[PDB]
């Protein structure tokens, strides 16, 4: 699990960092809490952090299931570029709501294929035992 736990720890650092950079723009544009609406910039910056936060648990499950049920090193490698394609994404959204697109592509690319591995790995586990049960019942005296 160690690499998986390393990648998750990056994720959490990355998430906390966006979170801090939202507090920064909240300061800059004098957007008093609990207001989450102001200039287009604060509204874009705050939005990135909000989308990253809603994709984090999806990324943590499936990272943990792609390692463990498919290969780990494979899973942790996707997990890694995904997080990078999310750093760049929040960097982008801060600039513009189109500088968010390029890294949002690299991110969903890496976020599926993690689903593919976790999917394959789980089928690689359930299918044999199923087909064994399927055939065993359908035998029946085999005369």
């Amino acid at each position: 699990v160690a690499l998986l736990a390393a990648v998750t720890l990056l994720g959490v650092l990355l998430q906390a960092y966006f979170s801090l950079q939202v507090i920064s723009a909240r300061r800059a544009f004098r957007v008093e809490p609990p207001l989450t609406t102001g200039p287009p910039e604060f509204e874009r910056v705050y939005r990135a952090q909000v989308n990253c936060s809603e994709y984090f648990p999806l990324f943590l499950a499936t990272l943990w299931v792609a390692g463990i049920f498919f290969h780990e090193g494979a899973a942790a490698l996707c997990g890694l570029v995904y997080l990078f394609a999310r750093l760049r994404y929040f960097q982008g959204y801060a600039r513009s709501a189109q500088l968010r697109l390029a890294p949002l592509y690299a991110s969903a690319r890496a976020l599926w294929l993690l689903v593919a591995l976790a999917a394959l790995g789980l089928l690689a586990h359930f299918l044999p035992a199923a087909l064994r049960a399927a055939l065993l019942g359908r035998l029946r005296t085999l005369l």
Copy 2:
């Protein structure tokens, strides 16, 4: 864990699907990002996905703790109807903010009772060792 990991993988698929269906309504009603406010429909559809996303980690913990510390097959069965009662929920909220209620009931039903199992299972683990410690100290020479 395999069933637990199967149910979590469904969860992640279900979450990603809502996410995509929000992008669809974001397209339809021409709601340029980062705006999360428009017609009542986009505001309802976007809202479902936002509530589902905030209940996902609560559901992932407790799924994993109801299996493992109480029975797994039991946990995975609740996990399963919960996700269905969330598919139907987002389907509902899209229609109306009352067509969301019926599956929101079936969902909190399944989301507690998962807390009940995870609760029971954890007490089934800590209580014995506690009462053993309680009695051992209160002995004391037992004359």
Copy 3:
């Protein structure tokens, strides 16, 4: 893991409780769903629950990685005061957007240091094997 699973179960209870208390203020100030905007109170109460929900997965990872890869009892103890410093936080934000600060301090205090432990623990695991690989290659005939 049992304490870690106990602390996570508290987290989930705490999260569900905020969630219920938002439904309460949603009722009180007649804020029909899917509106997430009204009086300053509903806007503060709803905001606390929204921030707590975005910090929960960050707290669940790192709790699980601070136990397991550093000491558990240590991890579960931080996890515990963090959740308390989040109960108090939502209590605070309900009162005012400054009665939120005091427990938000106690919370980020406990949320890092959990990152510190998970960080230390993961370095305590990877560094030896690395320096072993570093030295082994740089030998080379040691004449």
